[PDB]
């Protein structure tokens, strides 16, 4: 998946379909967010 | 995917002529379980990484 080295297999719930809601927000740069020196 | 070495004389340098970039999910082998009904153009196959 991420890599291709099978590290472990304990407690792998591979029976589901629900990609969950993540979150959303709005980036507001009015005070200095997202800038650098 | 299996690059061993350059087996040439040790005073000659190597240079390419074409760069082919691929995506992060590449494998040059076909699926062997979906070839059992074909007669013509049967390719060599293996088990690709996850
Ligand atoms: C991954 O490794 C564990 C322990 O080494 C093993 O029990 C499991 O079967 C492996 N998974 C696969 C798909 O080979
Ligand atoms: C999907 O996950 C939820 C919990 O996150 C579980 O209740 C549900 O049974 C899972 N669906 C399936 C088909 O197993
Ligand atoms: C390197 O090895 C390959 C296969 O063993 C052979 O085809 C090739 O001619 C070799 N190169 C030299 C310079 O011996």
Swiss-Prot record, chain A:
Carbohydrate attachment residues: 6, 16
Superkingdom: Viruses
Function description: Attaches the virion to the cell membrane by interacting with host receptor, initiating the infection.
Protein name: Spike protein S1
The organism's taxonomic lineage, starting at the top: Viruses, Riboviria, Orthornavirae, Pisuviricota, Pisoniviricetes
Gene name, Swiss-Prot/TrEMBL: S
Full protein stretch here: 14 to 50 of 1351
């Amino acid at each position: 998946v991420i890599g291709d080295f099978n590290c472990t297999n304990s407690f792998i719930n591979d029976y589901n379909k629900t990609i969950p809601r993540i979150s959303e927000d709005v980036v507001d740069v009015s005070l200095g967010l997202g800038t650098y020196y | 995917y299996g690059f061993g070495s350059f087996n040439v004389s040790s005073y000659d340098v190597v240079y390419s002529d074409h760069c082919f970039s691929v995506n992060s999910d590449f494998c040059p082998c076909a699926d062997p379980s979906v070839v059992n009904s074909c007669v013509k153009s049967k390719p060599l196959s293996a088990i690709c990484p996850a």
